[PDB]
Ligand SMILES: Nc1nc2ncc(COP(=O)(O)O)nc2c(=O)[nH]1
């Protein structure tokens with residue numbers, strides 16, 4: 681099971697971010713995903729310029745410390761300019777949570793040879809007015825078509841096919857029942873032949889198993905084990921130690 685641990689580093693103090701990145705490295709992260717725009721339901725969006733001013737103080741040291749430890753760095757942004765600036769600093773992935781919502785994102789990814797995650801959503805920020813209703817199978821078919829259209833855009837604009845990673849965006853306009861349905865059927869997304877990233881960690885989908893937000897890391901790890909068994913290529917998680925345990929258990933079940 682080649683599943684990589686993508687440790688979440690939210691910077692929404694610079695010194696505290698460096699300490700968190702260091703702890704994520706020491707507990708076994710394969711990638712540090714650095715993000716400065718909270719996408720939580722009540723959050724109003726910040727500008728790309730404000731986003732970058734939060735990142736530019738921490739990203740050089742995080743990149744140095746991670747690369748020194750042979751850990752990669754991902755930039756979690758919907759803005760092509762932020763991805764471009766982060767790429768100049770040396771990050772390894774664009775985690776394009778907007779899924780080419782910025783029309784300049786393909787040019788940035790292609791001109792940088794970076795790996796790119798594109799994540800499905802019903803618009804950002806999330807809204808209860810923009811939420812899927814209907815048959816769960818049809819939702820999965822829609823997510824696949826939405827992602828495939830964006831894959832085509834990237835390849836046409838010069839992004840190599842091997843560098844594209846697909847993420848269904850659990851929770852983004854997806855009520856808990858639908859997010860579990862997608863996770864359970866993640867193999868159908870995997871059958872497209874692209875690496876898959878899943879971001880289930882602490883998500884409101886766990887409200888369905890009455891587990892409140894503060895206690896969700898252990899339930900997250902239970903699902904992490906299942907996702908690792910399905911050969912999901914990247915898990916975007918808060919607790920890197922527990923996720924390492926989940927992947928080792930999946931390996932022992934092969
Ligand atoms: N690729 C990807 N990126 C993401 N970025 C942010 C969040 C929001 O979750 P957080 O508030 O816990 O960071 N979820 C995802 C996700 O599921 N996939």
Ligand code: NA
Nearest residue numbers: 747750751752
């Ligand atoms: Na590296």
